[PDB]
Every structure is written in structure tokens, then in C-alpha cells.
Design the sequence.
């Protein structure tokens, strides 16, 4: 062996790389707690620190807020892979650091954010959430990178002796729902930044993906699907939707309402009260005309303030026997699109009441004055009846074992069809006895009305059209030649097509070291096959050649914090880490070249290097000594005279130039002026190591690094506290980082750097595809 | 299984392997003492932001007792986190003395630095503060010891010439650390028992060279006792005349420490400068130094640094005066005396040696002075007869030099002729050998303080200190006879520090596939090491012989105020396979009061917290599993469920509703109605730690039984050392757990280890500990 430190031979073997992959499942230990009672914070900080060893920080204002954040999170950035919980108590007022700024910094480091600074010192809510820190450590019931959670993990079951003090834990499923929510929040943030009109905030979800309807209505955008091949439903009508062939406590009503809220920006909601499920939706741009006798004056103000929509609530019954546009205040929807949500019903003469409604909806749909889109009515008829302008007769996917159906009226519906009673009762007898999973499964018939059939690669990309392709375009049906052509054209067209694909070389490195076995995922060349479908792999370089920069889910949720209304997560998933997400290059240059904390790689640049330095006995200054030695081995490998430079190998000086010399490089010859100090970019080396295990923001960091060749003024609208991680000149501008020579020099030694840190058990393909992408960013 | 807490998918066979690997990092603490608080805050931020080192600043804003309680209760949970921990202590020495803070530091396996007397711009203070930022997560100051003389040079990690690397021999350095800790414990034993200075002699069973240095570093005299010492092959009564063939100041300490073992009175001729002696505590010695260059300050400097009574003569030694009234030898009447002759001249060296030899041949035949040993430099080119000559060895650290050493003794050869032609070719061979072989020949020198015979039949009178570094554990001595020797030693109130490989800890290491079969092979309790055979001993059968297992952590912490040896930098898995045991009589007499030096604080949390982080085990959920494990045991003994109520919290394991008893061999467990039961959680965690490192379960159990009721704090010990435990307003250590709460945890201990390690534990490890807990609590 070898008896010397730092030791990489005996410490970093193939099983060590496996354990590093395992540690990445714990890489979100931060909890940011905001309370206005400092002495109370000191107690619980001591309680959780003594009981479970959680590292605590108390930003109390004794130090300036900018330097206080700089000292707190520069330390946390190194400990994110330490498998130990980290709590940061923020006790300064919201005037010192606002709720949105602190929430951004929290989610930028993958942490749970709790804001309770308005609470009194003896608040039952404040003390309870503080006791949860000590009870649940090292875990915490508050979701990370999100305010709400609707998955199966119930933290209160961990304290219950009846449930054996256990709860469920589906990391891959929960992070998938977290990813669907983050993509939606980023598109919502995209619409807000581009000042897109409210009625134009529509996103195309490539491939059928049910949960996107809910996430889109949570962020104030309307969803629309586009599937490659949608099979025939098997019913009657123009679209064949009449009788087709066959854990959220408030999704029973949100399943139908969110879909109807996608068909129009104006809604006639009959029988709305209480409509409590709508309160957790951002409806800023909608106009709700609510009809119910139990509607009060406070109910209208409560719905409008919680959703942002213009709500006009009528405290009367709906006049169904008046056939005029002057009744029920329908005059406010002239020359407009309108949809009707009918939830009215009675247990006395239900057949007689439905006939009165049907005659009104059959007339309301034939309005040349109002573009009535869709009308949803409760259907339960024991007699044969003819329906005009009927598009769909679907069961209630969340109605469970109930007997009621739903009818959908549309202009392009069946001109006249006869709904036989003996056919619906038998149809319901089958739907009534199905499993709950199959009952909820039949909600795809409902989403068919907002689905366009065709190829997503041939769609129109006009005016910055938002298109979410969740792993869709990457599957083997679409060729890599055509997908790269679609994304390159989309970037030229200034369109927002968020694209995701499996990282080819990250999965190859996972199978090489024996992480995920051959039984789960099999790979051949760049073609990937998943088991319980085939899929193409894409690297980070070829997508930059198509004009797409890889961004991390961490950076997307952090950049979209002030508009995020979705769900969070608790644990990371190795399966989800195999994929990478890319946004077009035009939007990166326009609004993402100024590296704030939300768009910084702070949550990844230090945690991997520190973990390896602790495992391999690498002292701090010794780490920078190895940096100079690696540079010394590269300069002499290119026949540079050793007397022309002087290897310092410190944190501030990599090496000093003594006489002018140049190094041949494809991105222009590296110019080294005499009597100058060279300090190569260390983040490039560490981000390449982090790319072996998780999605690395190397491409976005490089674009920011090139933009920081000179001093750049801070954005005027953004809070300047978000730039705490970087130096700011007294002028008020972000200080220059590194020269193009210092950055390209680190890319050349990057191959030998990974061979040192991982004991030659790295992936030269991972370093190669990143090195190739760094060169294209710094093209001459 | 998709449920948390998860033990199935998380704790596999390789997971146990990685836990063993983490135990190599289980000493990350650094305790830094400086009197400049704002300067400490800066370097605390510098090392925290650069390397992620967790820092603590005890500044006095909180009371010192509560401040230590909050700081180290947290550190105890993080000792397996692979991250450096620094504790800056800025309060005055009046708030916490240097010896108290050093004990607390070494109790948690930490490097201790005391620089509170330094000014804010001291070049020494700032340099050692910059070393924290430069060397993190490592540190150049050794743990549990002030000095380090091994091959690891930290300044080479910063040098580009050495490729920023240095050597790293963890097993060798920790072995030297163990030899030094054993010596320091014996030295602490002599200080506690008030043993007279001249009686402080320890027997080192089996030949072990470095113990001569460590003993003289702690003011005690060593003596060897070997099973079979081969004949040296020379002439003389003991055959020591011409036998058959990294410390910068060991060149002189090799000879002087051996001569300082032969007598408590020394005549050092040619002492100046004698700088090597300054690092030894010679409290009890009397040095009569002869050299012209001796000054008045030199005598005071030697006496202050060593504690010895030094009388330094600023003159030459009168060799041509044959009387006890010359050279002030009148102070050694009716006393033992040994002389160290280091005088020499480059002009007529032969003529000067003949004058010395005639004096030493007369000085050895003194009925007035019990002259023990005389060491003279020998270099004669002519044939000469020597009277009263015991040995003539080469200088083991003389390297390629031509000079030899002669040793005069009363029991030496009455008359022998030293032929010049034989000693010239003998030096020609000694000069040509390797340096390792030159130093290897220092066993001939130590032969003069070596008794030949069997250590199992020695006399154990009046608390005799005997150190057996794995010697008694080897296969030559049967386990039946060794256990008989140790049981007799404990009855005789003797101090025989005994060490042996932990049978079940090595078995658990081989079962999971840590140390492979090529290095260590085991059969039953017989162990074979590669690169000799050895018997294994468990913690229970040694308590049956009246011996309690103590950890090297607790020994160096308990001996902090007398420790003068070396520290260590990294732990070694090879050394962790062995356990160290001290007699039971000394544990009951002075170790039943659990202070921080004798507490298992450095092990009771770090293993449980690491497993809770790996397996997603919440804090309160951990205590829920505790009650469920108790509920599974009470039901297994046919206790009616309506007689108790499972609470499963940190303060209440379960509440008793009606009186019921559980049959147990240590008396039936009595559970009074309307009372709360809180089983001892430390017993469960110490059993888990016993799978990987030496666990102080036996010592903790003896302290736990003594803490059945309140006990007054010792009057002499600083009461700050009891910060880890509750103290009543009366000034006494508050009671811990009842005998029912402790024995109840021992019964669920088997199922507890099956849950924490996913049934991949060792029932033998739990069994030998559970058996020992019963013998401590025997009725």
C-alpha cells in the first residue's frame, strides 16, 4: 500500500464512490427558521444541538446582515454532505431581510423555510413548530424547497405508538411531484419576468401528465397537453367521449374545478359555497361569477384576497327559467369566453330539476354574444332523454362508489344524441365496482378536452411559447438529430421550451461503479432502457451546441421563489439525479448572467470537495498545494520553460508569471503577462466532481463566469442582499471574478484533477463533455 | 420496504464496514485556550468558512458549568461526523484551570492548546491560530498528549518540495501512544496511593524498549521480566562483554534513561549541557553534576525543569584522589549511587582512560556507598585488564563512530583481559550494519535491568505496578492460569495493568469481512497474527477474575495532571481490537465517582447519532422504539398489558399501574405501582459502541450501581469536572437509575442491537456484556 497523507489510493475505491452516491440522498439538511424572539431561539437552538447534534446558527443582528449571511452560508456550503441537520434561526426584523429574500436563500441551499416573525413569544403555533425541531431531528416535518406536501409521508405517525412509530417514504415519487411543481413554478416565473399578458400564460405539457393541471392552476397558468398518439376513447360523439370504454384531502373537488379553470379565464360557478378548495390557488387573472344562496359579503372578499381573482358573488339562486343574456348578470361576459361549473342539485325531484338545467345549458351554449366554451353539469337520469350539444358524459373520477355522472356541453358537441338509461346504469355498475386507483385513472377522459393530438416537434413556437417536456422528447421515439434541431430552432425563436433528458455520462458512471444494477436500467451506447420503456440520453455539451444551458432544480425553485405555490420534498432520489434539465440559452443571457444566490452553485461547489478532503486527510492549504502541482504538471507538459513561472500553490496565488509566454489553446492562445499572479477558478474543478453524482450547474456557471470578466453593475430591482455570496465594490457593482486564461487553464487540468480526487476512478467522458462545453462558452 | 425509520436497506454488511472506517476519524476535537476573545472569533470564522469546522466559543457570557454542559453534550453526538471541532476557551484560568480544561479535552480525544498568557500580537499565538485554518480538518498538535516524536511531519504537508505529503503510520503511532498512556496511568496510580518516590517501580512483562523512555518521562523506574531471554554470547558473569550481533535528542536519552533506572542518585561527570534531561520529570532523584562549564543558572534550570535535587560543581572531576571525602561523595553515604562518565579528550585518550578506570575499579568496591552501575566511554587500542567489569556494548546511537561503552558492576567479572584486536573487528562489524540494527543492539544494555523468569509467579506485594502489554495474552500462557494470576492480583490489592485482544470484537470484525483472513486468523478463542499466536479474552470472564475494562481514553484523561508522554493523531482499527483492564479494587476505591475523565461521554452518543442520521430515526421516535422494545419484552415474560402503560419518551419509558415482578437472576425486578420507569439508555448505546471500539461498559456499570442513591462529590477534585452530570444544591452527585431500570435495559439489549444494526450485530458481544452486567449487580 502507501503510508502517506493525503491518501487517495486506500480511501477512494469503487465502494467509496457508491457511498458518495448514497450521501447525496441526504444533501438537503438545512432548515431556516424565522422568529422574532431571540432568547427563545437560543433555547431551542441549544435543545436541538445537545439532543441530536444539529448545527445551529443564530443571525441576531449583532453583525451586519450582509456579512452575517456571508459567514453563515459559506460554512453551510461545505457541510451539506455531512449527514447532519443544520438550523439557521433568523431573528432580525423583516426590514433587515424580507421573507422572500430569506426564503430564496433557504431554498437556494435546499432547506425548509419557516416564517413566524409576526408571532408572539407565547404563541401556541410558534412553540409547537420549535418543539418539532427537537422532536423530529435530524428530520423535520416542514417540506424542503416548498411550503406544502400532499404525499404519503405523515410525520405525526413517527410519534404514534399505534403505527409502530413509522411512516411511508417514497423518495422517487415525491421528488417527481416536486420536479413537476418546480418546472411549473419556473414557467410561472418566466411569464412574470417577460410581462406576458395574463390570458396568454399558457404552457404546453408534452405527453400526458395528470398532475400538471393541478400545478399549473396553483401558479396562475393554464395547461394544455399535446400527445404523440392519443388512443380513441371508445364512446360516442364527435370526439367519442360519451361513455368511454373502461393523497390530497381536497383533490376531490380540485380535480374537476382546475380542469374547468383551464378552459376559460371567466367562470360561472353555480352552487359555489363554500368552495374552500379554490383558496389555495393563484387565480390572478380570472373572473368568477358565483351563484349560491349561502354566499355572504365576507365570502366574496375572502375568495378574492386569497386567490387574486375578481369575484362577483350573488347571494341568490340561479334563474334557470329565464332565457336571456340580461339575466344572472351574464352581461359582463359579452364578447368574451365563458365556462359554466354547475354544482347545483336537490334530493327532491332530481329528474325534474335536471331537465330545467339542461334546457338552459342547451340554450346557453348557442350564444353568438358569448363564446361559451364548456359547461359541466351533474348527470343522474333514470329515464331516456335526448341531449343537444353534448361533448362528453364522463364518470366522476373522485366520486368513489357514488351513482352520479357528469355531463359536458360544448359547441362542437354532438348535435343530437339519445342517452339511454339502461346503458348508463350498467356503465355505472362497472365504474361503481372498480378499484379507487382505476376510478381516479379515468380522469384522462376529462383532460382530453384540453389536449391537442399531433407531434410536439412540429408545433408553432411563436412569441415565447412556454412548453414543458418532462422527459418526453428524450424517449427513443424521437431521434437525437431531430430533437436537437427542435431545441436549436426553439432557442433562435426566443421560445421557452423547458427540456429534460437523462444525463448519458452520469448514468454511465453510475453503472460503471455498480450503483444502480443492470436489472433496473440497461444502457447501450446512448440508448437507455428503463424497467418497472426505452429512452435516448443527452449530454451537457451537445445541448449547448443546440443553444441550451443546463439548470438545476435547486436553481429553478430558488429563482422562482417569489411566485412558487407548489409542493416541496423531504429526501432526494438517486433515480431523479440521473436526469438533467435545460433551458434555452437566450433566457440565460438575458436575465441569468447576474449570479445572485438563487442562480449560484453555492449549494454544490464546496460540499463535495470538503467531503473528500475529510475522507482523504487533505489539509486546507495542502489542497491548494495540489492545485499548483497539477498546474505545474500541465505547463511543463506543453513545453513551457519552468523558469518562466513560479508555482505558489495557495488559495490566492496559483502561480506567478516571470516572463511572457503563451499556451496553444483552441479558445485563443492563453496570454500570461509578466509580473502577474494567476489564480485559476477552483469552482470549475469542484463542479466537475459534483457532476459525477448530481445535476451540476456547470454550463450556467460558465456563462456567468464569462460575463464576469469585468465589473458589472447590480440589477436595480433585485434586493442587493441576494448578492451576499460574492464581493461587491464600493460603487455598488459585482466585482470581477477570473480572467479567461484562469478559467480555461482550470479546464485543462480538470481531467488530471478528477483523477487525483477520485483515485483515477472518475469518468473521463463526464470531464470531457463538460470540458467541451466550457470551450464553446469561451469560443473566440 | 418504503418506510422510515428504515434499517433494512440502510444497514447492510458494508454499512458495518464503513462504521469501522469512521472510527478511524473519531478524534476530531481541538481545544484552544487564548485570552483574546475577539481574536478567537475571527479565527473561529476563518476555519468555519474555509473547511466547515464546527466552532464553539466559551467566552463566559454563560456560567462555566452550564457552558461546558451545553458545549460537550453536543460534541459527544458529533464525534463520528468526520468533521473537525474546535472549542475556543477565552475565560481566565480562575474560571477553569489549565489541568481541568486539559482533562475535558483529552476525555473527548482532543488536542489541547494552552496560550492564555500570550499577548494579542504574540507571534506564537497567531501562528498556532493560523495552523487551525491551514491544516484543517487536521491539526499539527497531537491529541491526548503534548509531544509527538513519530514520522508524521505536518510542515511537510505545506512544502512543495515534498509534494505536499508526509508519512502516516497510524498503528505504530497509536501503539507508542498506548505505551505512554499505560505508563502515565501507573504514574497516576503512584501519585494517588502516595507511594514513596523510591518505591515507584513498574515491571514491564516481556521486552518492550520504549517503556524505559516513557517511565523516565513520568518519574518512575522500569524493570523488565521476560519469559526466555537468550544468552547474549559474550564473556563475564552475565555474558555481556562483546555479545554476538525519530527523536532528535534520543541519542543521549537512550543511555541516560537506562542509567537513571539503576539508582535514584546519579554522579554525572561531564553533564553540560545535558539538554535532553530537561523533558524528564525526575522528582525524587539527586544529580551530582561535574563539568567546568557548569554555571549557577544551569543548576537552577535543571532542578526546575526536572524537579530533581541538582548539585552542580563548576570544576573538573578529581580522578587522582581515592577517597570518599573527594568530589563531595560524602552525600551518598549508606545510599545507592550510579555514575555516568561522559568525559573525554582528544589528546592522549588512552592515558586519560587508564586514570578513570583505576578510579572506577576503586569506586565500585565501596562498603560505604552501594555503587550500582558505572558507565564509561571505552576506546582502547592496547590490551588492558579490567576488574569488576559487567558489560562492554557498542553505542546503539553512536552510528558510524568508533567508541564503545564499558559498564562496571559489583557482580561483574573479577578480572578479564580486553584484547584490542578483538574489539577492533567487533567495531568493524558494528560500524558496517544498518542503523536499524545498530539501535536494535540496545537490548544488551537493558539486560542489566531485566529479571529472567515467569511473570505469572512473581511476588505481588504492597500494590506492585506491573504492565503487561499483550504479553500475558499470548498463547504460551493458558487462559486458566492467567485468569488465576489476575484474580490473585486483585485480591492482593496489586496494580497489574492487563491487556488482551477482545475475542468477540475481533470475531465480529472477521464475520463482516473487515480485516481479511490473510492478516488475522482466529479459531475459538485462539488468535494468530501475521506480518505469532495469542489468546483472546472477553469482558465478562475478566470481571469474574475481578478486572474492569478501562479505555485508553479514560486512562490518559484520568492521568492528565501527571501525563508527560506522547499523543496521537489518528486512531487504528488494529489497536481497537484490544481491550485494557485494571483490577477491580482500584476501580471501587477511586473510580466510582464518575467525573468527566472516567465518563463514557466520548462514546455514548456518537454511535447512536450516526445510526439515527443514516436510518432516518427522529429524536422522539428513537425513544418510541425504546418503549416498543420494552413492550415486546414485558409481554414475552407474561406480564399483563393492563399492569403498565407504554409512554416511550426520553423521560418516561413506561408507567406502572399495578405491582408486578419480573423473574431475573439478579433478584426479581420490583415495579411499584404509580411510578415511572426510565431505563438506562447508556447501557444500550455502549453495547453498540462495543462492536467497534473498546467500550467502558464494565466501568460505567460499577459507577451506575454506586449511583443508586445520592453521593457527595470528592473534596479534592475540582467540581467543574462533574459538569456532565446533575448536581443537587447540597453539592452531591444526583442519583441516576434504579437497579430495575438498569437491569431492564440489559434484557432488551439483545433486541436493541438487532434493530439498530438490522440483525447484523453480534449476540456474543451482547452476551458477554449482558453476563458482565449481571455480575456487577449480583445479589
Sequence:
Amino acid at each position: 500500500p502507501d503510508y502517506c497523507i493525503p491518501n487517495f489510493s486506500q480511501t477512494v475505491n469503487e465502494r467509496t464512490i457508491i457511498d458518495i452516491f448514497t450521501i447525496c440522498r441526504y444533501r438537503s439538511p438545512l432548515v431556516v427558521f424565522c422568529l422574532s424572539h431571540n432568547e427563545l431561539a437560543k433555547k431551542y437552538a441549544q435543545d436541538v444541538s445537545m439532543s441530536s447534534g444539529t448545527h445551529v446558527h443564530i443571525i441576531d443582528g449583532s453583525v451586519e446582515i450582509t456579512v452575517s449571511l456571508y459567514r453563515t452560508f459559506r460554512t453551510i456550503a461545505t457541510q451539506l454532505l455531512g449527514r447532519m441537520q443544520i438550523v439557521v434561526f433568523v431573528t432580525v426584523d423583516k426590514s433587515v431581510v424580507s421573507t422572500q429574500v430569506m426564503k430564496s436563500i433557504a431554498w437556494a441551499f435546499r432547506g425548509s423555510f419557516v416564517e413566524l416573525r409576526n408571532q408572539s413569544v407565547d404563541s401556541s403555533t410558534l412553540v409547537s413548530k420549535l418543539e418539532n425541531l427537537v422532536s423530529f431531528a435530524p428530520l423535520y416535518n416542514v417540506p424542503k424547497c416548498g411550503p406544502d406536501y400532499y404525499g404519503p409521508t405523515v410525520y405525526s405517525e413517527l410519534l404514534s405508538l399505534a403505527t409502530n412509530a413509522r411512516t411511508h417514504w417514497y423518495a422517487t415519487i415525491d421528488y417527481s411531484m416536486f420536479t413537476r411543481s418546480v418546472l411549473t413554478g419556473f414557467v410561472a416565473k418566466y411569464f412574470n419576468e417577460e410581462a406576458v399578458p395574463i390570458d396568454k400564460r399558457i404552457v404546453s405539457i408534452v405527453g400526458y401528465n395528470p398532475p400538471y393541471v393541478w400545478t399549473c392552476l396553483r401558479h396562475g397558468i393554464r395547461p394544455t397537453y399535446i400527445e404523440k398518439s392519443l388512443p380513441n376513447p371508445g364512446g360516442k360523439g364527435p370526439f367519442g367521449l360519451i361513455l368511454p370504454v373502461i393523497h390530497n384531502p381536497q383533490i376531490k373537488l380540485l380535480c374537476l374545478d382546475t380542469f374547468m379553470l383551464s378552459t376559460s379565464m371567466n367562470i360561472l360557478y353555480i352552487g359555489a359555497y363554500p368552495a374552500t378548495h379554490l383558496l389555495s390557488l393563484q387565480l390572478n387573472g380570472w373572473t368568477i361569477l358565483a351563484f349560491d344562496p349561502k354566499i355572504t359579503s365576507d365570502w366574496t372578499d375572502a375568495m378574492a384576497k386569497a386567490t387574486g381573482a375578481k369575484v362577483i358573488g350573488v347571494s341568490k339562486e340561479f334563474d334557470f327559467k329565464s332565457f336571456s343574456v340580461q339575466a344572472n348578470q351574464l352581461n359582463m361576459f359579452q364578447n368574451s369566453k365563458l365556462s359554466v361549473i354547475d354544482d347545483t342539485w336537490v334530493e327532491t325531484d332530481y329528474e325534474k330539476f335536471q331537465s330545467e338545467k339542461q334546457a338552459y345549458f342547451e340554450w346557453l351554449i348557442d350564444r353568438t354574444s358569448i363564446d361559451v366554451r364548456l359547461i359541466s353539469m351533474k348527470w343522474n337520469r333514470s329515464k331516456d332523454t335526448s341531449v343537444s350539444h353534448l361533448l362528453a358524459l364522463l364518470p366522476q373520477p373522485y366520486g368513489a362508489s357514488i351513482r352520479e355522472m357528469r355531463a359536458f356541453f360544448h359547441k362542437k358537441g354532438a348535435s343530437d344524441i339519445k342517452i339511454l338509461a339502461a346503458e348508463t346504469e350498467k356503465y355505472m355498475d362497472d365504474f361503481t365496482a372498480m378499484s379507487v386507483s382505476d376510478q381516479i385513472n379515468t380522469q384522462k377522459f376529462m383532460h382530453c378536452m384540453i389536449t391537442t393530438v399531433g407531434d410536439a416537434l412540429k408545433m408553432d413556437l411563436d412569441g415565447g411559447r412556454a412548453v414543458i417536456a418532462s422527459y418526453s422528447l428524450s424517449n427513443s421515439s424521437n431521434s437525437k438529430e431531430r430533437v436537437l434541431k427542435f431545441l436549436s430552432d426553439a432557442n433562435k425563436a426566443k421560445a421557452m421550451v423547458v427540456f429534460g433528458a437523462p444525463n448519458t455520462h452520469r448514468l454511465a458512471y453510475a453503472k460503471k461503479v455498480g450503483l444502480v444494477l443492470d436489472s433496473a436500467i440497461k444502457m447501450s451506447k446512448d440508448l437507455i432502457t428503463f424497467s418497472n420503456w426505452r429512452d435516448y440520453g443527452y449530454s451537457q455539451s451537445e445541448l449547448y451546441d443546440a443553444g441550451y444551458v443546463e439548470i438545476t432544480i435547486d436553481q429553478m425553485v430558488a429563482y422562482s421563489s417569489d411566485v412558487y405555490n407548489g409542493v416541496g420534498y423531504f429526501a432526494n432520489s438517486t433515480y431523479n439525479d440521473l436526469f438533467s434539465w435545460y433551458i434555452p440559452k437566450w433566457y440565460v443571457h438575458k436575465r441569468m448572467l447576474m449570479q445572485d444566490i438563487r442562480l449560484s452553485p453555492a449549494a454544490l461547489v464546496k460540499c463535495f470537495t470538503t467531503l473528500i478532503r475529510n475522507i482523504c486527510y487533505v489539509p486546507h492549504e495542502t489542497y491548494y498545494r495540489f492545485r499548483g502541482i497539477l498546474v505545474d504538471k500541465y505547463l511543463r507538459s506543453k513545453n513551457v520553460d519552468p523558469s518562466q513561472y513560479s508555482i505558489v500553490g495557495s488559495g490566492s496565488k496559483t502561480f506567478t508569471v516571470l516572463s511572457h509566454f503563451e499556451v496553444p489553446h483552441e479558445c485563443g492562445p492563453l496570454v500570461f503577462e509578466a509580473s502577474t499572479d494567476v489564480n485559476i477558478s477552483g469552482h470549475l474543478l469542484s463542479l466537475a466532481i459534483a457532476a459525477h453524482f448530481v445535476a451540476s450547474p456547470m454550463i450556467l456557471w460558465a456563462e456567468q463566469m464569462k460575463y464576469m470578466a469585468v465589473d458589472r453593475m447590480l440589477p436595480p430591482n433585485l434586493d442587493k442582499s441576494l448578492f451576499f455570496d460574492n464581493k461587491v465594490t464600493p460603487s455598488g457593482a459585482l466585482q470581477r471574478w477570473h480572467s479567461r486564461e484562469e478559467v480555461l487553464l482550470a479546464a485543462e487540468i480538470c481531467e488530471s484533477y478528477a483523477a487525483m480526487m477520485l483515485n483515477n476512478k472518475h469518468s473521463p467522458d463526464i470531464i470531457g463533455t463538460l470540458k467541451s462545453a466550457i470551450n464553446l462558452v469561451f469560443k473566440i
Remarks:
- The longest strand of chain A covers residues 371-379.
